Design an enzyme around this catalytic site. Structure first.
Site, PDB file in Angstrom:
ATOM      1  N   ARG A   1      28.504  41.526  41.747  1.00  0.00           N
ATOM      2  CA  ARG A   1      28.888  40.744  42.911  1.00  0.00           C
ATOM      3  C   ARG A   1      27.629  40.097  43.533  1.00  0.00           C
ATOM      4  NH1 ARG A   1      31.922  45.615  45.816  1.00  0.00           N
ATOM      5  NH2 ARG A   1      30.057  46.485  44.845  1.00  0.00           N
TER       6      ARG A   1
ATOM      7  N   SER B   1      36.438  48.392  52.070  1.00  0.00           N
ATOM      8  CA  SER B   1      35.258  48.734  52.885  1.00  0.00           C
ATOM      9  C   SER B   1      34.802  47.645  53.853  1.00  0.00           C
ATOM     10  CB  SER B   1      34.065  49.136  52.004  1.00  0.00           C
ATOM     11  OG  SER B   1      34.347  50.326  51.280  1.00  0.00           O
TER      12      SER B   1
END
Length: 243
Positions: free
Chosen positions: A229, A49
């Site tokens: 993350r 992405s």
């Protein structure tokens, strides 16, 4: 220079999350490496992405879309429920809505896409013959160092695109804002491979306008909580006094 940074504490943060990862930080022209798997910094991965940033730049530069265009959802169920609506390019950026970026890629077309990707020199700059998935399953690959350099150039309006186009893509990427600091960025996750790759790539704009760019790259597992993350990134940025 690219060098390992002061890493005792951040190395430990990565171990404590049971992951194998690197955090690349670029300030000015100095690049430092942190984490528990520093060799990942020079290893090639699919951008997944994260490519949406460059897809957007190419599409806008070449007038294949504009920031007000509403991409239409035709009614088919999609991979995620959040994607099942009409949306702009910027909303598709925030959601990483792949059908929109696939549509845009097809408008750009293979010839223009390969010419642009080669001009920018993004990663290995290889897009093959399939215009609509080359950033998801190969052959396009890119290292975390290359990603932090790319996003640093975006943040500084130094990419070889129009100033307005760069500003418009930057405006789609704001993630969080507090205490005068802004955090821009883009996540990615290649889920459908033997070694799942997780990305979080972007920059901090500090109160005085100074830019500190980052690229987090780590091995993902399905069992990991959703925020992992972002959680590792913010901890590490605080420790380095970037925020």
């Amino acid at each position: 220079q690219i060098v390992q940074g002061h890493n005792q504490v951040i190395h430990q943060y990565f171990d404590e999350k049971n992951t194998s990862g690197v955090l690349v930080i670029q300030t000015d022209k100095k690049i430092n490496l942190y984490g528990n798997a520093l060799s990942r910094a020079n290893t090639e991965y699919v951008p997944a992405s994260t490519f949406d940033m460059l897809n957007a730049l190419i599409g806008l530069e070449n007038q294949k879309t504009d920031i007000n265009e509403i991409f239409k959802w035709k009614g088919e169920k999609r991979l995620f429920t959040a994607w099942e609506k009409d949306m702009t390019l910027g909303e598709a950026m925030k959601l990483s809505a792949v059908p929109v970026y696939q549509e845009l890629a097809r408008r750009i077309g293979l010839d223009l896409m390969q010419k642009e990707v080669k001009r920018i020199g993004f990663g290995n700059a290889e897009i093959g013959q399939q215009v609509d998935n080359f950033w998801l399953v190969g052959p396009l690959k890119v290292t975390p160092i290359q990603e932090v350099e790319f996003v640093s150039q975006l943040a500084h309006t130094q990419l070889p695109f129009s100033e307005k186009v760069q500003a418009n893509v930057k405006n789609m990427l704001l993630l969080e804002e507090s205490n005068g600091y802004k955090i821009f960025g883009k996540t990615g996750w290649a889920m459908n491979i033997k070694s799942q790759v997780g990305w979080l790539t972007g920059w901090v704009e500090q109160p005085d306008g100074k830019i500190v760019a980052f690229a987090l790259n780590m091995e993902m597992r399905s069992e990991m909580p959703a925020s992992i993350r972002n959680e590792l990134l913010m901890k590490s940025l605080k420790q380095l006094n970037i925020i």
